[PDB]
Amino acid sequence: PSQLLNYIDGNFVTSASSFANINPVNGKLISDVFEADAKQVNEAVVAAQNALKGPWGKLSVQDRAALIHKIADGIQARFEEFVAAEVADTGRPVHQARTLDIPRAIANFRTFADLAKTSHTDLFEMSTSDGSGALNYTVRKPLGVIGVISPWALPLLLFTWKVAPALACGNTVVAKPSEESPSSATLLAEVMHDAGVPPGVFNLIHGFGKDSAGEFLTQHPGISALTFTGESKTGSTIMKAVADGVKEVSFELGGKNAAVVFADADLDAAIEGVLRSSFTNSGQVCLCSERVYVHRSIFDEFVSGLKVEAERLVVGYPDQDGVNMGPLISHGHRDKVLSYYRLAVDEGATVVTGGGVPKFNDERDQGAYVQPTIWTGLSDKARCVTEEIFGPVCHISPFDDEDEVINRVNDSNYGLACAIWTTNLSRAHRVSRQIHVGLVWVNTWYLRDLRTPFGGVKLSGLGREGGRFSMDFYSDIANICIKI
Template identity: 60%
Template sequence: MTVLRNHVGGRFVESGRTFDKTSPVDGTTVAVVHEADAVIVDAAVAAARRALNGRWGTSSVADRAALLRRIADGIEARFEDLLAAEVGDTGKPVELARRLDVARAAQNFRSFADTISAKGLDAFLTDTPDGGRALNYAVRKPLGVVAVIVPWNLPLLLLTWKVAPALACGNAVVVKPSEETPSSATVLAEIIAEAGAPDGVFNLVHGFGAGSAGELLTSHAGIDGVTFTGESRTGSAIMKAVAPRVRPVSFELGGKNAALVFDDCDLDRTIEGLSRSVFTNTGQVCLCTERVYVQRGVYDEVVSGLVEAAERLRPGRPEDPAANFGPLISQTHRRKVMSYQALAVEQGAKVVTGGGAPALDGDLAAGAWIEPTLWTGLDNAAAVMREEVFGPVAGIVPFDGEEEAIALANDTEYGLAAAVWTSDLDRGHRVAQRMDVGMAWVNAWYLRDLRSPFGGFGLSGVGREGGEHSLHFYTSPTNVCVGLTGPWSAEEAS
């Protein structure tokens, strides 16, 4: 049986309490995990502080960039180990995890190595009130000890998305992965140590949220900032935990993302894109579409096309080449998603496909499986059109004109992402810019440049990460102002 331990100050440590991590595919035990207690969390924070006060705190940009590139090399060298860890924890198809999760992990480290290497000094001359001049420049310093809390849907991808810029900027981190996906973080701890990171630069604590490692970490006096991806209500709890100490936070939270389909769209391209945005990773991506608004002229065709796409999905074991649809992360989450399926029907939805759980034989019957589900007949007042379900579900609603579509899409407390499908690029630009979201795609979905800002509005989060936007969170600037004397013009010089 695999045993997963906490990683503190360069060594793996056990605790006095463990929990079982079970497979969402068939309910079998994947690993026994040591849950961090207050003593271990304290030790992890202290180890991170020692690293900052030691040689890591005086490391150069070139040294840090070189470390990030060695970590990327280590990820590629242990690609199959990380792949097995991700698939074992999440149950997602092997090819999805290979293409999306693990490949992107190495890219994250290389991208931020390039970003920090290219970052120059911000300097400018200013006129002062007395007619003199001053040279101003900002020195960006590490934020300090950063708590990194990541979810279970894309555990390695999102972990590296946060750890890479944090280390690039010279911080030390204490990571808490989800209790549902502890395995890949453990492998990453080994890779970072093997890459030559000083002890304490990367620390790992396992556990749950409230009353466990998550709460202990976010409320710890030694934490200088928190970066978190996950549910909006958990983000709110973290904000309350750090408020007494006024610590900065970077949150990427939930979404109730809309797609707007206009009747001049390329139908085949649109339906393919919509099927990915609704059903990828069993709908367990913060950027997935749960609301589809379709202009009446193509409404029936879009509904039938999406139904066909949903019914082509095949559940099965991750390694089965015929399977292209995985389980939900847990039985607890399955119950939540199924409760929304029932609620949709209660509120008047017509289920055009799915609506339940697939009948699977053998060991798979114990897994957290669910059917891809599409509803019609609902409007924006329905709870399932307002609350994040985080499963392979979507409501499809007709509209008549552009202004109506924009109003429907923006009628939400969330503001993470949107997609606009149209052959009229003037309309595409116009509508995308009016979406109250952090990211708006036109004729695409999940197309990402790692230098672009990532984040949302409202219940979808606080702050932006990606490229130089990440550097703003993971550093604190000190402005240096140097008063200059001397002649400022040719007349004065003569």
């Protein structure tokens, strides 16, 4: 019964085609979503381009930031509706949407609004032959129209992570959320409209990737930049697509993240930590650990403790009492994950726990659930230990030596994140620095400070966002050089 419209030039509009939004909990229809055609994408980009020359473009940084705080207020005012939207689309446990996702999304807008108010640029004085000198100063200007394309994992969070700094920097936006999670972004458009954001400043287009809204956005010469979060192969495709236009790009892509547990770790803390890093969001966060290395001396105790804890996870309804894990995002994704589950056994894995789907004997059997899964026994070369699965799974392997484990962690075409567990001062700092990734946590997992640079190396992405890196990426950096 829910209908999700595009939002283009201050108007909610339908489209010729619509597609189904399906609750992964039970397989039921949540909404019809109007798919934007290439003409509507053009309408969005053109509206965005024009909006830069309107009231939005005349706003002082201070007024622009106040307006963005008004966006945040509007989300706050409709808090539980945003909670319901994320949960409906994704099966995410209510407790997590309510305590993490929606507050972080609000925090995205408030933080980048504040960064925009407090930020400044540089002055460089130079001597010249005639001895009267010159000044060089830098300015940040809006880059122009920012195309945003985002994934279904933590959808409102990752979507606003891009939309907030884009708007804070004075840009206008055309944004295409994942076909699998279009609700909260649609709600966000409403908040934009109600908050009085000028027509064309924020445009929402629904659709898929290839031969749809996503691809049409990437091929449009009217955009100044494409920021993207998704699969590595999608990243590469988009990088080719914007190449003729030499568009500014930012890619946050896949990973195969390791957690390392050294002999001097707090073992109970590491078990809890790896449990969370492996299975949070049912293993569907780019920051999850799918490879785990544990020192040989504590390997058996670690594996036994994690098995016990994993089998205590409650897989069930998003608002079921004590639920820890919802379903995967889709039947399609479940079929891929189970295909890896089979592959693991075929590759010689011992299945410590899970390896299948739960049996509910109710509507959830029509959903997309899988069991949290632990493997041992695979060599570092097994596909299941090298390819990103994006499910609730980890393979655990022993190690003996510090340099050895660092090399095995780094032996990967991905390099997003790593978590290290140790109580030793030197070890924490020495080892972290040698890990080839964009983010290392020591003795925790999933702490995010919006001020810090974030991104990956190798196939995990290019560039960094967060803090000044967002303020620089979403801005045109220009040098004005004045001869005195």
